[PDB]
PDB file of C-alpha atoms in Angstrom:
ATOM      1  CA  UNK A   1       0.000   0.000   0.000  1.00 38.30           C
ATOM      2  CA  UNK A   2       1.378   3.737  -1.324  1.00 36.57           C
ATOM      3  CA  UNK A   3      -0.271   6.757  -0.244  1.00 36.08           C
ATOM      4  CA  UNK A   4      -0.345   9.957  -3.317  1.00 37.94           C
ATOM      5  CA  UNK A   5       2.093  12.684  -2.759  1.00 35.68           C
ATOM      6  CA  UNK A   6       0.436  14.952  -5.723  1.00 38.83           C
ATOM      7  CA  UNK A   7      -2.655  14.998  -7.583  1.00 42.29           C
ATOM      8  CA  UNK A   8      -2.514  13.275 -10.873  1.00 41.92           C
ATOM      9  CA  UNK A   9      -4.874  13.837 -14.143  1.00 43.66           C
ATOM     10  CA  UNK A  10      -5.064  11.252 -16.588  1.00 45.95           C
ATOM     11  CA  UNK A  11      -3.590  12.690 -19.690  1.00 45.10           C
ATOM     12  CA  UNK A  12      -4.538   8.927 -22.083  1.00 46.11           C
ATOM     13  CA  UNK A  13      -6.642   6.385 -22.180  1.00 47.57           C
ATOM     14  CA  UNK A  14      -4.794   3.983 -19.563  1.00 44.50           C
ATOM     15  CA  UNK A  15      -3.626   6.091 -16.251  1.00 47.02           C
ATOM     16  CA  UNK A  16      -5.495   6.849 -13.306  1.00 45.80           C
ATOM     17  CA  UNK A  17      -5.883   9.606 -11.926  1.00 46.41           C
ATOM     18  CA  UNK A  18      -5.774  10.482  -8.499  1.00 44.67           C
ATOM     19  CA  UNK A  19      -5.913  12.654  -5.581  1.00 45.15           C
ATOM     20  CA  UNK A  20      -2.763  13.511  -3.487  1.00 48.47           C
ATOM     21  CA  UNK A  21      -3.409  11.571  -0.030  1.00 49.70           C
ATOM     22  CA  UNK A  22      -5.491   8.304  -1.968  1.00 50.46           C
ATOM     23  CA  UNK A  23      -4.261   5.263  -1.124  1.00 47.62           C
ATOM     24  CA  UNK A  24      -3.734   2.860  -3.346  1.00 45.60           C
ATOM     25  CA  UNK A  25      -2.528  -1.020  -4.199  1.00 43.73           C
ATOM     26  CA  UNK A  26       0.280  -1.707  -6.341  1.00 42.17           C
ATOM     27  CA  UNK A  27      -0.438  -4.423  -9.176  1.00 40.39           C
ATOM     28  CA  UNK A  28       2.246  -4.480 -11.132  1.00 37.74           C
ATOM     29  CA  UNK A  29       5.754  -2.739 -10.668  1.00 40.54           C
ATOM     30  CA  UNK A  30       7.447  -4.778 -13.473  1.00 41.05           C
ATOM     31  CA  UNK A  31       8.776  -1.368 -14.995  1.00 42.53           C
ATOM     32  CA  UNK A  32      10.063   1.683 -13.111  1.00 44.33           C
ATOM     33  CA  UNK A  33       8.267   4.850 -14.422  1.00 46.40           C
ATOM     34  CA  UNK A  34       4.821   3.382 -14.646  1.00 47.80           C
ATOM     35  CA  UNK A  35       3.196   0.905 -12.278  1.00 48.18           C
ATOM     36  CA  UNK A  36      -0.011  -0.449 -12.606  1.00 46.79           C
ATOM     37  CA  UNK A  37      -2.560   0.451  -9.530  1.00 48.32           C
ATOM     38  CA  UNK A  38      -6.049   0.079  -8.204  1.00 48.49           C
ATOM     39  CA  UNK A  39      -7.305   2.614  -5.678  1.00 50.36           C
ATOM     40  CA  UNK A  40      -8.343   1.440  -2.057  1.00 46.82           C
ATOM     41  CA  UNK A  41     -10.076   4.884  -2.118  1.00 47.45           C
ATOM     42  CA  UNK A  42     -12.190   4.219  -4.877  1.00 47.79           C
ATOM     43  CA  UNK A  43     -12.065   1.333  -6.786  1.00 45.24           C
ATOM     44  CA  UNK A  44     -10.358   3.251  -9.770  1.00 48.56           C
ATOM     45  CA  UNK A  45      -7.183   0.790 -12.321  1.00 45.79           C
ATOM     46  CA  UNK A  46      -4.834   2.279 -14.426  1.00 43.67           C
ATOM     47  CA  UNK A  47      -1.480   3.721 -15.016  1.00 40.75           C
ATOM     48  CA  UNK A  48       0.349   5.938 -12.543  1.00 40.76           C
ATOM     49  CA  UNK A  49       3.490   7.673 -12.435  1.00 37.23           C
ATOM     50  CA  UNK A  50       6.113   5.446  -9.934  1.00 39.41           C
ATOM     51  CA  UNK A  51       7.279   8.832  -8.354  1.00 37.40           C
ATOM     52  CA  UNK A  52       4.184  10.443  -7.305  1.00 38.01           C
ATOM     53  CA  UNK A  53       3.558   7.841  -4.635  1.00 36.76           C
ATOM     54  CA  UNK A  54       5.350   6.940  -1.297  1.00 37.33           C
ATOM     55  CA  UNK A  55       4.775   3.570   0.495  1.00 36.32           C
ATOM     56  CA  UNK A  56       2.651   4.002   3.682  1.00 36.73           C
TER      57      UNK A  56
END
């Protein structure tokens, strides 16, 4: 579990975007600049960028 640092907009058709302080689940972290993650906060998939979360 990773916790937002910034808000993120979606700029395509596969990130998520995201609030800064959402929580959210890491699915796959198989390359460095993108991971793939669902939102504990609300249910949301996609994209995100790897720095723009922390692990809490």
């Amino acid at each position: 579990t990773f916790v937002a640092l910034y808000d993120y907009v979606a700029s395509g058709e596969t990130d998520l975007s995201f609030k800064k302080g959402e929580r959210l689940q890491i699915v796959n972290n198989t390359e460095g600049d993108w991971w793939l993650a669902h939102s504990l906060t609300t249910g949301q998939t996609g994209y995100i960028p790897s720095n723009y979360v922390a692990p809490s």
